[PDB]
Design a protein around this ligand. Structure first.
Ligand code: 4KG
Length: 329
């Protein structure tokens, strides 16, 4: 392989992980690879909460290439807060290495229970510079600037549960990962990997909707107005009193998403947004679709989309490449 590949492992068909190294001695970490954020978050040995004790921790004291930064990072949420500081050190992705400014995480006081139960260590962003904290050039951008890769692009071939493993490839596109035509959609903004597509479900239509391609989202996000109209008489029921949608797995009235442009047509069948829940009932499935409303009519194409479609992320050409992922390698 003339390109840099990192193997992707599936986690119960809801999320996937990838491993990368931090430090001179190449300390290994399990990462969530996220195109919806743009920073590298690594837990520190200076993190002493219960959850952190069970994680792989970055010890800057055991790395020759560690360069002190110290710039405080405190990201606040309700639920909770993520505290830390910036650090610079050698980041190894596959067989490539470069000095990189990342965030050393000291405190995760909100997410302590879920983090513990989680099987990942940190988060590796794959968005754009303007999406990052502290104006940090994306790893792939930085790598090409350093003449370490052919092209400023990375590609996602996601793993399928119980079927096959996946790969993150940096620097080049490999034909083995996809079938059918490979079509490009130019970004409408250099922030998220967001493109402009027309969405169609049955006769329900929405045109020139902002579509964000995001590997950090387990579901498919749809405008609430769009969701209610598409689930009209399809033998699909809302849970009381929550926004959960349940249906029979064999529901023949289940529609297919259709995202079209001037260059390509992208469809997502029921087999891609249905999650089996045989616990509650025989032949019962849940719709992995969330009704979410942004100021602009926006779809979020999370894992269920990328699970079907091999994707290309081009910084140089400011575009997203989309093609039918091969079902077997
Ligand atoms: N992919 C992703 N990654 C995140 C990572 C973080 C995060 C939190 C702590 C440390 C590092 C990253 C927070 C939120 C998101 C988060 O919301 N997303 C989802 C993407 C899809 C849409 C976009 C977005 C845009 C506006 C409002 C809410 C969400 O973010």
């Amino acid at each position: 392989s003339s390109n840099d590949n990192i193997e992707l492992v599936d986690f119960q068909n809801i999320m996937f992980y990838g491993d990368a190294e931090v430090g001179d001695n190449q300390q290994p970490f399990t990462f969530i690879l996220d195109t919806g954020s743009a920073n590298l978050w690594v837990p520190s040995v200076k993190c002493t909460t219960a959850g952190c004790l069970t994680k792989h921790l970055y010890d800057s004291s055991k790395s020759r290439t560690y360069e002190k930064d110290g710039t405080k990072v405190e990201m606040n949420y309700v639920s909770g807060t993520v505290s830390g500081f910036f650090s610079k050190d050698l980041v190894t992705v596959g067989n490539l290495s470069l000095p990189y400014k990342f965030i050393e995480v000291i405190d995760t006081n909100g997410f302590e229970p879920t983090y513990t139960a989680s099987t990942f260590d940190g988060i590796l962003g794959l968005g754009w510079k303007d999406l990052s904290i502290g104006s940090v050039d994306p790893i792939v951008v930085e790598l090409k600037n350093q003449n370490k890769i052919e092209n400023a692009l990375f590609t996602f071939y996601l793993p399928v549960h119980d079927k096959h493993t996946g790969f993150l490839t940096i620097g080049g596109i490999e034909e083995r990962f996809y079938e059918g035509p490979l079509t490009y959609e130019k970004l409408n903004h250099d922030l998220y990997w967001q493109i402009t597509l027309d969405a169609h479900v049955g006769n329900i239509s929405l045109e020139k909707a902002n579509c964000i391609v995001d590997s950090g989202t387990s579901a498919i996000t749809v405008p609430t107005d769009f969701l209610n109209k598409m689930l009209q008489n399809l033998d699909v029921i809302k849970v009381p009193f929550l926004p959960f949608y349940v249906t029979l797995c064999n529901n023949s009235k289940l529609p297919t998403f259709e995202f079209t442009s001037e260059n390509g047509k992208y469809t997502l069948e029921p087999e891609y947004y249905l999650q089996h829940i045989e616990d509650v009932g025989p032949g019962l499935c849940m719709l992995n679709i969330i009704g979410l409303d942004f100021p602009v009519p926006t779809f979020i194409l999370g894992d269920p989309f990328m699970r079907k479609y091999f994707t290309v992320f081009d910084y140089d050409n400011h575009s997203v490449g989309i093609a039918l992922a091969k079902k077997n390698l």
